[PDB]
Design a protein around this ligand. Sequence first.
Ligand SMILES: Cc1cc2nc3c(=O)[nH]c(=O)nc-3n(C[C@H](O)[C@H](O)[C@H](O)COP(=O)(O)OP(=O)(O)OC[C@H]3O[C@@H](n4cnc5c(N)ncnc54)[C@H](O)[C@H]3O)c2cc1C
Ligand SMILES: Cc1cc2nc3c(=O)[nH]c(=O)nc-3n(C[C@H](O)[C@H](O)[C@H](O)COP(=O)(O)OP(=O)(O)OC[C@H]3O[C@@H](n4cnc5c(N)ncnc54)[C@H](O)[C@H]3O)c2cc1C
Ligand SMILES: NC(=O)c1ccc[n+]([C@H]2O[C@@H](COP(=O)([O-])OP(=O)(O)OC[C@H]3O[C@@H](n4cnc5c(N)ncnc54)[C@H](OP(=O)(O)O)[C@@H]3O)[C@H](O)[C@H]2O)c1
Ligand SMILES: NC(=O)c1ccc[n+]([C@H]2O[C@@H](COP(=O)([O-])OP(=O)(O)OC[C@H]3O[C@@H](n4cnc5c(N)ncnc54)[C@H](OP(=O)(O)O)[C@@H]3O)[C@H](O)[C@H]2O)c1
Lengths: 486, 487
Amino acid sequence: SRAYDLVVIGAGSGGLEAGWNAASLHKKRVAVIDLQKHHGPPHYAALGGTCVNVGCVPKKLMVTGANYMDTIRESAGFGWELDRESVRPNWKALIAAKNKAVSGINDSYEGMFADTEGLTFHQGWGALQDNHTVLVRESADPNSAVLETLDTEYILLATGSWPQHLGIEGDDLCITSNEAFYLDEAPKRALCVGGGYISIEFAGIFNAYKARGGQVDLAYRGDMILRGFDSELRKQLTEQLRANGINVRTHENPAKVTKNADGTRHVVFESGAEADYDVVMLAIGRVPRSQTLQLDKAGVEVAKNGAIKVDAYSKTNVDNIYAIGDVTDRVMLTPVAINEGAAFVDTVFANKPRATDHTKVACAVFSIPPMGVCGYVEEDAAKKYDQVAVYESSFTPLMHNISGSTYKKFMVRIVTNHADGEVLGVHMLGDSSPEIIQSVAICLKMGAKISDFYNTIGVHPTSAEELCSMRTPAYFYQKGKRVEKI
Amino acid sequence: MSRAYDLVVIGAGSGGLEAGWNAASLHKKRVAVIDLQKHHGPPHYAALGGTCVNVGCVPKKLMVTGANYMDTIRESAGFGWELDRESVRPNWKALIAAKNKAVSGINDSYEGMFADTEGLTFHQGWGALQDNHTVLVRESADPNSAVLETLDTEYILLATGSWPQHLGIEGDDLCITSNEAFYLDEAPKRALCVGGGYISIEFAGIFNAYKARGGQVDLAYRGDMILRGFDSELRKQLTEQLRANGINVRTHENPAKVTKNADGTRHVVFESGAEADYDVVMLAIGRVPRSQTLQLDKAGVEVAKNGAIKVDAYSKTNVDNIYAIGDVTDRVMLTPVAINEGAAFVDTVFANKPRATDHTKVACAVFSIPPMGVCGYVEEDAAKKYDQVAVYESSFTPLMHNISGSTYKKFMVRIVTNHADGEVLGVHMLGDSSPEIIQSVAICLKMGAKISDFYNTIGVHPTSAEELCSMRTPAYFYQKGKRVEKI
Ligand SMILES: Cc1cc2nc3c(=O)[nH]c(=O)nc-3n(C[C@H](O)[C@H](O)[C@H](O)COP(=O)(O)OP(=O)(O)OC[C@H]3O[C@@H](n4cnc5c(N)ncnc54)[C@H](O)[C@H]3O)c2cc1C
Ligand SMILES: Cc1cc2nc3c(=O)[nH]c(=O)nc-3n(C[C@H](O)[C@H](O)[C@H](O)COP(=O)(O)OP(=O)(O)OC[C@H]3O[C@@H](n4cnc5c(N)ncnc54)[C@H](O)[C@H]3O)c2cc1C
Ligand SMILES: NC(=O)c1ccc[n+]([C@H]2O[C@@H](COP(=O)([O-])OP(=O)(O)OC[C@H]3O[C@@H](n4cnc5c(N)ncnc54)[C@H](OP(=O)(O)O)[C@@H]3O)[C@H](O)[C@H]2O)c1
Ligand SMILES: NC(=O)c1ccc[n+]([C@H]2O[C@@H](COP(=O)([O-])OP(=O)(O)OC[C@H]3O[C@@H](n4cnc5c(N)ncnc54)[C@H](OP(=O)(O)O)[C@@H]3O)[C@H](O)[C@H]2O)c1
């Protein structure tokens, strides 16, 4: 028997879920380790992990702020008069408010530890000495002071992921989203590099808060942003992004970043194009944060990219060490890590083997306008099924007639297995699609068919009723081939 | 002859237009649609597109969108937006002008549809029946007016909608109803909405945003609490949030006499003996089936005591070739329910695809500020129909509103279930976006979802809708009709 039942390394969405359920629902001695207790430099994350501190929660408060540049512009069309020249955004006030809010969640979690018997927080760098001994050192350097040594039954690794760096000359003058949450002034000219959702979301933020002559550029090495998402939506989002002032640059990737005399960055693009920017933000990928846990010391196998390898039940190759969340590089989303933490406590401390279903998980992109997506994209479904039907509706929501932002089309598209009518993926662009898609993913867990959609009576006037208005396929794929008739 | 027309539709509203257009376009019949007017406005208000396009859903939602801006411009200050907050002014004439050109564009679209659907024709005037195979198109509602046309038809479809109800009181002619509210040339300073339904609570939101600076909007309603028929908790939260935004909710209040002051404004004396004075007194206390000028006795069609045309599952009347759909039948009064009914009618009769419209678990949204999204049964009803009811409840302030300053804005979702098998019987939400969330929840409820279907879906974060998936434990129960607590 050991001093601790469970030692969780990482106090994030996964680790906090597993830690609280094991101590509370199962009366275990759980020790949770994290570097920091309040959000901020030097480690950015703290209690609550990347979601609370430098992820979902601060980013969404900041996208809600970014949104008012649009709604103040659009109130003109509904008769709201005001001195439009006085309208100035204020970055410092936004950052102060954000900071205020995340500090509350940090304090919420000291309360959780202080009120759960068996749950204790232990601040520092956790590293493995063998599969029953976790060390808490002062810093990642394996020659720093060990602050305490914990003897334990099971170990759960929930260390998350870290921004990926480009190895170009000048990478150290670029920032990543961690530092974007702590900037002092909003950049007048900014470069976001990557076409994934963290890039697009931050481009929407910077675009709203820049000084009046400013410009935001989004650079992407590929052909069209947001690879892996539905093509048509990717095409449509690129236009609304450009219609709000962003210079989307595809097939573009930086080569050298140099600091200019004033402190701005001089980028030389792989194309030979050059430009100067107040801030260059690297949002090119999040890599699994496993590289300093001394996993080698306990025999845990990691992947090429550093992902800790785990089976369906999150077990590694060492029988009492499990790993969950982003470090396992399965679907990197907060709900998915929370699920995995709950399954693990059932598997290990309740002996109810549970496995997280990583399929049909729905996700949103909080761009302006937003996206809400779930299940297959037609190219994939087309590969796995002989007859796929694709449905799509597109319309400007009426308020946008009167508002002036006529470039804002709501778009909804549905991919089905044409044989049985089962819905395989629903993809949406427009406001409120993050909210609409949550209820759509429930339908998709239950095996909804397309007649289940169009036999439901609509709620009018709403965009979401278009989901129940599509009864005829726009086109098909018969045996991998796009086709118009079957 | 043969019979000159296949179907004559009286009423070019939601269900009428659905039927007339599907029957001619898809089944090639010769269809005559009758309406009083081609473009919105006085004197009839409703025109092509009916009540919803001209004086109902579409104008009301645009004016609700405008009304919202009072709160979004207020709330931007918490997120660092700086502006001359003194200079903010609503301008009602600009709202009505924009609204009016958005509605007239839709009237032009319908016009084009008659122009290019071969077989479909608009006929204009008052439609009345002569016998079950002859519709008269008269000059006006008067049974004596000149009859401009006589249509010899096989089928008659009655899709005439409903109309505002009036109080019997002295002064009733000084009050307006929602038809005129869409046409006010000046937003009222002080205004009273009487009624506790969705139209009333909706116009209190609109007048409250556009009033001049010291204005007041009062909503009077004779019951104990507004929006009878909805979730009890949600009616308490909506009343407090209405109040928190400046609307004075006077319950157990009903006008007794309205009189005109010298200055123009109206003086209302409540039955309580309370009295006040207002620019506008709007009455939103009920909608009557509009069937009285039709001469249904000539064809022998039976109507309910409130004017509702009595119909069966297939919308057929007691006269076999006459059918009725939409609000004139008084089943569920909503545009999507009339549309479904219209399409089911053309399948049954012309496509030999018999379809009764299902009127259970129809979702509906109340576009108040904040809005509500509702589908299925309220717990007090479920408790009378099932021996074991569990209520799951969750309410939270979006952290958005900690920063925004509107801390009164609680989001709330309440789920009612049959506790034996855990099927979800009703989902009821209050809060922003709830009308977009409930549509997709109505699909789950028609499939027969159980609450394990909800809490085993992985959430999308950060959203309000993800509370639907984070409810695992019942708050209290109803065992054999009594609110129990451990079951
Ligand atoms: C900018 C951005 C936006 C995002 N937005 C969304 C969104 O809106 N929705 C969504 O669902 N997902 C979003 N994500 C992702 C989401 O934050 C992650 O999926 C999720 O937090 C990962 O969960 P986790 O349990 O693996 O731990 P994480 O939440 O990353 O937590 C990891 C924890 O381990 C700690 N740590 C690291 N190594 C050690 C060590 N040796 N000792 C001790 N502690 C250590 C980190 O300090 C710590 O906080 C976003 C991510 C980013 C970066
Ligand atoms: C203020 C308001 C807001 C509403 N908001 C919503 C909402 O957001 N969502 C929703 O689902 N529902 C809403 N409704 C209800 C919805 O508008 C109606 O349920 C729907 O339009 C009814 O469809 P209908 O086919 O019965 O006829 P209607 O659309 O009312 O059409 C009736 C048609 O018949 C014509 N007519 C009547 N008598 C004759 C005659 N003798 N000859 C010729 N023509 C005649 C009327 O002029 C004509 O427009 C609202 C209604 C109002 C009043
Ligand atoms: N919508 C969702 O919520 C969702 C979606 C997907 C993933 N995830 C998850 O995955 C994480 C990382 O997100 P991310 O936004 O950083 O996106 P990611 O999609 O890998 O973003 C990388 C982007 O940069 C490009 N890129 C990658 N490596 C590059 C390189 N070396 N040089 C140049 N460009 C390069 C990629 O182009 P290519 O696309 O051509 O590689 C892609 O456009 C999230 O934190 C995690 O939550 C969530
Ligand atoms: N949420 C929705 O979308 C919703 C809800 C229900 C129905 N509907 C649909 O069906 C309809 C009828 O619903 P409604 O809400 O308008 O119905 P209603 O109850 O007739 O609405 C009238 C409102 O005024 C009150 N009232 C009625 N007669 C009164 C009188 N003579 N004296 C004083 N006040 C009186 C009613 O109170 P009491 O309740 O005390 O009578 C209620 O508060 C609508 O036309 C229709 O579009 C929609």
